[PDB]
Every structure is written in C-alpha cells, then in structure tokens.
Design a protein around this nucleic acid. Structure first.
Lengths: 82, 82
DNA sequence: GGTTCTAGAACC
DNA sequence: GGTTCTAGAACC
C-alpha cells in the first residue's frame, strides 16, 4: 500500500485470522484489542519484527495516531483519531 | 528514610532476599538486574504497588536517575548516575 | 506525591 | 525509515 510500513504491518496483523486470539478488531469494529500482552508479544510480534518489544509497538501506534482506550498491564485496547 | 518513596521501595526490593530471583544487585554490586521482566511483574511488583505496571516502574526509575544498560524485551538491567 | 499515556531524541 | 531510551504532561 501507500501507508507507512508500520501501518501496513498492523493491518496484516489484525486482518490475518491466524493472529485472531492475540490481537483482533473489537466487536463493533470500533478498535483493536490485545487481550493479553504477553501472549501477543510471544506469538504475534515475532512474525512481523526482528525484535519483539511491546513498548516499541505501543510507541509506534502512538506515532501513527492511535491512543490507548482507558490490577495489571495485561490487556490493551487502542483506537485511532482519523 | 529521607529519600523519595519510590526510591525507598526500590531499595526494599533489591535488598529483600525473598525477591532475589526476580530482581537483584549485579555481581560486582554495580547495578540492578531483572533477569525476567514477566516473572518480576508477576511476583515482585504486587508486593509494592497496587498496580503492577512495568512501564510505570521503568518511567520512575528514569525519573530518579537510573538508566537502562544496553531477541526479546525479557531481561532488563539498570544503573544510576549518582 | 503516584501513575500512566504520549512525545522527544538519538541511536540503529 | 526502524527502534528504543528518556522525558513531558496530565490525570489520579
């Protein structure tokens, strides 16, 4: 596509059914949910990056207009401005 | 002590032998090592904070002069300026 | 003060 | 461009 590479990766991620259990669109096709950060870093990130680093993932999500939608740091949900 | 509360927690953390396997001083008593971030967040953080959030932990370490000493984001090692 | 989301900055 | 350490900012 014409979108930034990171953005293309994210798209492949949430639209590739094999990642479904770790990262998926929300029911109302509203946002993106990562039920369990640990499982997601283990199983999904390595298919797309040489280094599996959740912090680097979140940093880039922020860079491209995604925000975290508001006890542990296990579940994560993000939504985009545009 | 007179040091900031976060700093007192960190001290209790690395000096309390029961946390030894998750967070400890380095051999040369040089820095602080967290062999496995996941185990550390599971077992150590909850004894000290209502919320176990590694990112909030790292943020505060930076706030108080600690720096990360330079494939996954599993192992972490920090050292202090002063 | 305590916490956590978002951005700066500098290295790759 | 890719990545990751450190700091700003704003809410608690």
């Amino acid at each position: 596509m014409a979108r930034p590479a990171f953005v293309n990766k994210l798209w492949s991620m949430v639209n590739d059914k094999s990642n479904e259990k770790f990262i998926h669109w929300s029911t109302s096709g509203e946002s993106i949910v990562v039920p369990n950060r640990e499982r997601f870093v283990q199983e999904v990130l390595p298919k797309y990056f040489k280094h599996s680093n959740f912090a680097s993932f979140v940093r880039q999500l922020n860079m491209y207009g995604w925000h975290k939608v508001q006890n542990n740091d296990s579940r994560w949900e993000f939504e985009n401005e545009r």
